[PDB]
Amino acid sequence: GPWKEDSHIVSAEVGEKCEAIGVKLLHLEDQLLGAMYSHDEALFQSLQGELQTVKETLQAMILQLQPTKEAGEASASYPTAGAQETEALVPRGSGFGKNEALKEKADSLAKEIQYLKDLIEEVRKARGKKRVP
Numbered sequence: 001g002p003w004k005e006d007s008h009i010v011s012a013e014v015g016e017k018c019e020a021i022g023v024k025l026l027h028l029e030d031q032l033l034g035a036m037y038s039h040d041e042a043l044f045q046s047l048q049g050e051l052q053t054v055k056e057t058l059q060a061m062i063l064q065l066q067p068t069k070e071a072g073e074a075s076a077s078y079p080t081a082g083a084q085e086t087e088a089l090v091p092r093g094s095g096f097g098k099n100e101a102l103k104e105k106a107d108s109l110a111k112e113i114q115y116l117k118d119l120i121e122e123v124r125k126a127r128g129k130k131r132v133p
């Protein structure tokens with residue numbers, strides 16, 4: 001009769017999965033600070049593979065619980081006028097050297113964690129506890 005295995009066990013399985021991603025996120029943040037300050041090669045490879053596996057599993061989780069449509073989808077345009085221009089004259093770098101290669105990776109990883117945090121917060125808020133009547 002039944003074709004699918006998951007029908008009732010989905011709301012009780014998300015809580016444990018969310019707690020697992022939370023403990024992994026905290027351990028990944030501590031290992032990220034220790035790997036960037038101490039500088040390593042093995043820790044960066046393991047961090048990239050673990051981050052890609054958590055991102056792929058998180059995308060599959062949101063694609064499994066939340067349905068997807070083929071026809072439709074809204075596109076963004078964002079209005080612009082053009083006010084105030086930014087110009088570079090003094091890079092500034094006191095200490096030992098200059099930071100440019102580490103800044104790009106720090107902003108890219110920080111943006112990926114911000115989107116990852118908003119995604120986990122949206123699934124937690126939508127399923128589990130509801131706000132207002």
